[PDB]
């Protein structure tokens, strides 16, 4: 709803991060939060 960017969402969602897959997954429900293959 805030119309945040993908990088902003990835940075903010880097609190539920658990634990080549290229994807972060939730520490609680194991859902795809975002992906990081390469930074542009």
């Amino acid at each position: 709803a805030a119309e945040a960017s993908y990088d902003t969402m990835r940075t903010k969602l880097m609190k539920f991060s658990g634990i080549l897959i290229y994807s972060y997954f939730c520490k609680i429900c194991g859902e795809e939060l975002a992906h990081f293959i390469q930074e542009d």
Partner: protein
């Protein structure tokens, strides 16, 4: 069991060519680096996708 025919067996010099299957083989999943222009996967194993 012995073969009915005598078999030609002897020392032959052989060379291992430096084409290793471990370096040539490649398998990729549905994710990885994509070209920023076309959105298509990158090129080959070296780019880790394609």
């Amino acid at each position: 069991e012995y073969f009915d025919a005598a078999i030609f067996i002897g020392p032959t010099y052989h060379q291992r060519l430096q084409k290793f299957v471990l370096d040539d083989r490649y398998a990729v999943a549905s994710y990885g680096p994509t070209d920023a222009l076309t959105g298509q996967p990158l090129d080959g194993k070296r780019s880790h996708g394609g």
